[PDB]
Amino acid sequence: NLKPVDAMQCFDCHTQIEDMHTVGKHATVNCVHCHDATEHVETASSRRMGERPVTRMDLEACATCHTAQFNSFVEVRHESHPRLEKATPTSRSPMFDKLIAGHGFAFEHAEPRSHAFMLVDHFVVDRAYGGRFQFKNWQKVTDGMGAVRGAWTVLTDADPESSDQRRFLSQTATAANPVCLNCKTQDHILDWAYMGDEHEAAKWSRTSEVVEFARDLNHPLNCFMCHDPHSAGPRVVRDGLINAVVDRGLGTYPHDPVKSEQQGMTKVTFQRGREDFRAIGLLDTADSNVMCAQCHVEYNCNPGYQLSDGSRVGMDDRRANHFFWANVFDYKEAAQEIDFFDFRHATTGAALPKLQHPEAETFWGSVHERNGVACADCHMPKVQLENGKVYTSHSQRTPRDMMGQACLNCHAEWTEDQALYAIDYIKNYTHGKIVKSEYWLAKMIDLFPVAKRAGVSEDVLNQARELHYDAHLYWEWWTAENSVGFHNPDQARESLMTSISKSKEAVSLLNDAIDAQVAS
Amino acid sequence: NLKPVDAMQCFDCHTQIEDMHTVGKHATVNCVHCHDATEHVETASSRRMGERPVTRMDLEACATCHTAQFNSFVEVRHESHPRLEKATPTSRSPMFDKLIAGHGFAFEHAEPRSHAFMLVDHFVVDRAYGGRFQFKNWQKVTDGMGAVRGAWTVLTDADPESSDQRRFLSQTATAANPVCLNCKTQDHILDWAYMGDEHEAAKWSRTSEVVEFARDLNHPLNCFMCHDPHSAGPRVVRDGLINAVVDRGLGTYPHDPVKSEQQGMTKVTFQRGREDFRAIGLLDTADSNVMCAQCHVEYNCNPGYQLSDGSRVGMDDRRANHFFWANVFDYKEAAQEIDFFDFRHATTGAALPKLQHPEAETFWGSVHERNGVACADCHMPKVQLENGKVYTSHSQRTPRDMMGQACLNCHAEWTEDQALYAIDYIKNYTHGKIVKSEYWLAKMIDLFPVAKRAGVSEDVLNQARELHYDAHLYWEWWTAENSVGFHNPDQARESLMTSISKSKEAVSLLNDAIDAQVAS
Amino acid sequence: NLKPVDAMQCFDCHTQIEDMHTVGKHATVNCVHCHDATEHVETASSRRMGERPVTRMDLEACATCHTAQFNSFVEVRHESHPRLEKATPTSRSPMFDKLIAGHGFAFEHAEPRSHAFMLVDHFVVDRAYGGRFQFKNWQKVTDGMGAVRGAWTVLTDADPESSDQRRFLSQTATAANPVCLNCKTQDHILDWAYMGDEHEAAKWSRTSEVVEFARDLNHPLNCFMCHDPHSAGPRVVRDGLINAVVDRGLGTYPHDPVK
């Protein structure tokens, strides 16, 4: 049984915590729920930590008083098909392997499944750790609660004796690095300096051995990623997001200065040895658009190359942890502003960006976003109970599972079937354009070896490579983005038509150049 | 409240209407239900119209006394997936973009959905009006009743100030022309001369500005397309069909002179200034095979080219509005008889036909057609009511939704699951052959650039182009035709095997010619 | 196929119908839909009917243009349990027999079922006609559409040769009388004087032989009970109601003079 500690004693040294804790809705929640600080209190001074207190980061620390939210979070949506590869004819990107050739995603890229699995899925995907980590057996893939209890309760490491990234199976990659983990867990929140920069007080950083870092991490999507444990108020903890919104002053809604001001973020910095160490972003309001944008964004979390000179940009560089915080039509400019690209296409040699799940940036400017709707309205609605205390569902899943609460409450003119039909109209239309964009990209890509072998000049190949960048960007955004156009159908339409235009331009350029070589 | 007019006064000048109206089941239906003729009657002479009476073409004009039929017609089948592109791996024609390259359908070709949407879908498809028309917002896509009330109640025009066909978005085409509208609406039935020929009394014709014509049209599938408003008797109004069956004497069942005689059509012509202007085809019987053949047929409704000399055949030519009225094995001959093809393939340069939904011509000679079954038996059956006045369902949709009334009433030996399994056997088999036909067509198409670049002779390329015509015809008929072989499975099988044979012949020809060039 | 008649000619004598028909939403609906008046027009004067025109009272006369309303009306609710006696422990009035002893309802009083059956149920109930009328067989009890087509298409009379109310089975009663029928049909609307008073022009009245009257009646709940066929406007036709509301001045809402 827990025994309370005297928080006044802590507050003597922890003024920032005092100011948060005493004012919020956790003012009566004793520190012992999450911290074991006995030896810390015996040894600390006002500027030196002394013995490190233990801080609980398990979600059960919150589930004791918030079982409803915890249970809704950990529910596994069995209809979210697991380990479903996107590069197949029946999934999101039928020609993905040809289009992404040269990139680590060619090894495996599955559709997302329920949040409980995020950390385990990150660890076991074929592109991440060379196949080092596996579930203990193939039955464990169902065990959401187990994954939440801790990744290492359900996973095995092929070689606990080594800590290097290497292939354990031939068709795997070792793309994982420490930045990835920031969107899977915040178990490292006290051990990682802001942005993963080198820091005396940080156990882990962008340049750490990711296998060793992995072994230290257990829990997915900690509840405190969106809720300050001290004030219980809304926040974000993701460094990349704070950096974009606050440090770079882009604001929470870069396209709406007024909304950015009303629904803003306040950066709170915590120090170690009186030197800035870590930060959180306190939100003005409980704005799930910004909470979900901690992870559902396009980002860099990887080494890459400079657009200017093609030189390597390694994990040690700040750019290896970066939120572009730019919609699809501002993205090329945002990548130019940091002088960065992700990979060279294996066939065309083009410098290309790699886009990932840009839901937050896609949502900006959509009809729903403009009308003050937020992710949670459709994906974590309040529960409707005939007789019950209302709480917010933490199931984070498609509104198809709860259309009454997620759509039909606003769309009184529709039945569930009508609303589903509206969704399907958009997704079907968008998917048709994605498929057409891929057809044209693939047609362009296939001409590169023919052009090279026909003696087409490097100048013409480079012209086509520049078009490839744009054709790729304006296509890939939409296979990366999870709503298949729903979050912003007009933007998807304009973008995908732009992709096709670019590819058609490249096809015509290469075809003409090949024919001119043949004629000469 | 409507006030009746004295029809005897009209009949003094309108003898044809008198002869139809006084004899049929609308003999007691007063003209005021559909015509406002007060100023007309004040100003007309026996040969000069004077002020033009207003004629209601809205479906509500009939819904007042026939609500059951109207309601069954306007029902939206939400299971008929909307805006679902056919050129995707999960739809009807996975390799459609490669195979149709050079044709406007490459811009967008979706599966059909419920009839209520036909006119709006025609207006908004990407291949039709350059993206000029859109639904007012993405919610309106569900609104069948709204579309029926009028296209312009649910659509917007990007530029009401101009009337030219142009692209408003890059990846669109402007394939629409006035002939298309004849299979979407007959709001223009009093404003369009037979076949769309130029006529002093016709506001619109094949050569009209289609954007201006579009703006004048509102209602889909008017009830009077199949039912004469004066006699209430069965008819067709579609000029192309009347022209094939009656003018060209092909008959309602070209393969069965006896059935053509028993279930025939009588052309009734109406004049303006004592000159033939428009026509209808009165049917001997209420034969839905011929009613549905007003639209569910292969047709020309577009400019094209002559097979003989390759010269352009424009909208001004009669051939731009043409029902081939020929099954797949008679089609090449029917296209030769008018010296016509649709497009040149973008890759192979072959002159090719473009086939569209030839359900009527495919149905001929099938077991069901031979046994006197008609479209309505499977797609608009009589309602079965424990206690009720029976009426004919106007829902026009797959029999899967009403298997009791559409199949099982004739097929007493089967359960619903057995009947569905029989359908699926045919569709699965046919689809497998469609996919194989496409594989071979694509393999042939891919050899054309290789052959051209290897120096293969024009004589050999032209030989392969002639094979392409046939390979394409005997494949495309079946992606165009909506039943995936069900309407005539033996014919689909023979045709698709013919396609593959033709493609294989072309592949062998080109491969050999390429190898001979390489060896020399 | 119906052939329209000259309604203006009718109106030369039928001013009341003119004032209703020409103004309402049936102004375009020709008389031939509901009346066969050819011989009537040949023989009538404004003061002498001549040949009595035939008036259709069948609901099909309306169903032709109003199929949706007709079909919703005729649907049988199979969940409305049929012939369910109220005087049982599981129904509405477990002690009904004791309490109602001395009244004809003691012989049978079932729960209501769908409107399509009202006239046939009236005819076959044990308390009404001594058991004289039965469904043609026990299968016909399902046939709502049949009952609507006409009671005598689905019922049999045990003795077509007599017209007296008598028992045909021991535990029946003969409570039916002509007034009952006013809440089952209005096929007699042109043959019954207001309230069922004796009248030279009334074939039927309160004192008629109910068995003879019964045989003349076919259709349940005629559509025109609530809708005037001439104006299409809302109405009632039930004499007892008009008498209460108008003649006795009680009004449509006796507890609310404004309403």
Ligand code: HEC
């Ligand atoms: C019991 C000892 C608790 C533990 C452990 C945690 N929380 Fe809590 N929380 C608690 C109470 C009594 C309340 C106030 C309830 C009220 O509405 O009066 C809360 C409140 C929250 C809220 C809402 C805050 C707001 O400003 O609206 C959140 C988001 C919340 N708590 C989250 C949370 C998390 C993430 C925890 C684990 C770190 C957690 N709580 C622990 C009681 C208790």
Ligand code: HEC
């Ligand atoms: C980083 C810590 C994340 C935050 C914050 C949010 N999401 Fe997320 N989401 C994340 C991952 C890594 C995954 C895939 C997990 C896996 O194992 O595959 C997801 C998944 C979703 C899904 C799909 C769920 C399913 O049933 O398939 C949805 C609908 C989703 N995420 C929505 C969402 C919303 C609305 C958020 C703010 C409340 C949110 N997520 C936060 C990573 C993270």
Ligand code: HEC
């Ligand atoms: C936050 C900005 C993220 C970083 C950095 C990484 N991931 Fe992620 N991941 C994120 C979200 C919001 C989702 C769900 C949405 C989606 O489109 O997938 C994911 C999902 C995964 C998955 C499951 C799906 C799949 O791709 O197979 C895996 C295996 C995964 N993520 C691994 C991964 C690795 C190896 C990373 C560093 C290279 C990485 N993620 C970074 C959010 C973020």
Ligand code: HEC
């Ligand atoms: C961001 C991705 C979230 C994570 C991780 C968690 N929660 Fe949450 N929570 C979130 C939102 C957007 C809201 C609603 C805010 C609003 O006012 O609209 C909530 C709400 C809570 C509450 C308040 C009571 C309620 O509304 O249900 C509690 C107690 C709460 N959440 C607890 C909770 C716990 C225990 C979590 C880990 C399992 C957890 N939250 C994760 C967003 C996010």
Ligand code: HEC
């Ligand atoms: C309602 C107006 C929505 C808002 C606001 C947000 N999203 Fe959404 N999302 C919506 C729909 C209708 C769909 C398609 C779901 C389907 O079943 O067809 C989506 C999809 C997602 C997904 C993929 C979910 C899955 O396929 O299982 C993710 C990860 C997702 N959305 C996340 C997301 C975030 C982070 C949002 C705020 C920025 C957001 N969505 C807004 C409906 C709505």
Ligand code: HEC
């Ligand atoms: C009421 C004033 C009507 C209007 C307006 C329309 N129709 Fe009609 N129709 C009406 C009647 C009374 C009948 C006869 C019913 C019977 O079976 O006796 C009809 C009949 C039809 C039929 C059946 C004809 C046949 O020969 O079997 C059709 C196909 C029909 N009506 C169609 C129709 C259409 C398309 C209308 C709008 C142009 C329309 N009707 C108007 C009454 C009325």
Ligand code: HEC
């Ligand atoms: C031209 C005026 C048509 C006539 C006459 C018929 N049909 Fe039709 N049909 C037509 C179009 C333009 C469409 C597609 C509409 C759209 O917006 O996409 C259709 C569609 C059908 C379908 C598919 C319906 C669905 O649920 O997807 C069926 C089954 C169908 N048509 C059958 C059919 C029959 C049996 C007809 C004679 C009674 C008939 N149609 C007439 C155009 C026209």
Ligand code: HEC
């Ligand atoms: C009658 C002989 C037709 C002419 C002329 C045109 N269309 Fe049509 N259309 C017709 C039918 C029977 C159907 C449904 C069956 C099917 O296979 O689609 C259609 C359907 C459409 C659709 C919806 C499906 C799609 O292709 O995306 C559209 C957008 C459409 N039709 C447009 C169109 C245009 C632009 C035309 C002139 C070039 C045209 N149609 C002519 C029948 C007939």
Ligand code: HEC
């Ligand atoms: C051809 C594509 C049709 C269109 C457009 C409309 N109807 Fe129709 N109708 C059609 C058929 C094949 C039939 C049955 C013929 C047969 O005897 O088997 C019908 C029937 C009618 C009837 C008769 C009563 C009945 O059988 O239900 C009516 C009153 C009728 N149809 C009305 C109607 C209206 C109001 C329409 C526009 C909404 C309409 N029809 C369109 C074929 C076609």
Ligand code: HEC
């Ligand atoms: C029963 C013997 C049929 C007759 C006669 C006609 N069709 Fe048909 N059709 C039939 C089946 C079993 C199917 C496949 C439906 C499925 O769900 O698998 C079809 C398909 C159509 C379609 C496409 C419908 C859709 O996919 O939603 C159309 C447009 C169609 N059929 C039209 C049509 C016409 C015009 C006919 C007379 C010439 C006709 N069909 C005859 C069954 C039967």
Ligand code: HEC
């Ligand atoms: C069915 C739709 C009808 C049409 C059209 C017309 N009439 Fe009618 N009429 C109808 C019924 C069912 C009855 C019985 C009485 C009732 O109120 O329901 C009648 C009655 C008459 C009478 C008798 C009135 C009386 O004195 O008791 C007359 C003189 C009469 N109806 C004339 C008439 C004329 C001239 C019509 C065409 C303009 C006509 N009716 C239409 C049903 C219907």
Ligand code: HEC
């Ligand atoms: C077709 C020849 C009809 C016959 C026979 C009957 N009715 Fe009718 N009715 C008809 C029309 C064209 C209209 C007007 C439709 C509109 O809204 O414009 C009507 C109207 C009615 C109404 C509504 C009247 C109102 O709102 O004021 C009712 C209640 C009605 N009709 C009833 C009715 C009955 C009971 C009939 C049998 C005696 C009947 N109608 C015959 C067309 C036709």
Ligand code: HEC
């Ligand atoms: C006299 C002509 C009636 C008028 C006018 C209405 N109702 Fe009636 N109703 C009547 C009878 C004789 C019966 C029983 C029929 C039988 O065969 O048993 C009924 C029955 C009902 C019921 C029960 C239906 C069921 O499913 O069991 C209801 C709910 C009902 N009646 C309601 C009702 C309403 C709302 C009316 C005005 C629109 C109405 N009735 C008129 C006799 C008559």
Ligand code: HEC
């Ligand atoms: C209108 C004021 C009515 C008169 C006069 C009669 N009945 Fe009736 N009946 C009426 C209604 C509204 C209902 C349904 C509601 C209910 O409580 O039953 C009925 C029902 C019947 C039934 C079926 C139920 C039953 O009692 O078995 C029968 C057999 C029946 N009515 C017969 C009947 C007889 C014999 C009448 C004259 C003595 C009689 N009804 C008068 C409305 C009215």
Ligand SMILES: [Ca+2]
């Ligand atoms: Ca990226």
Ligand SMILES: [Ca+2]
């Ligand atoms: Ca064609």
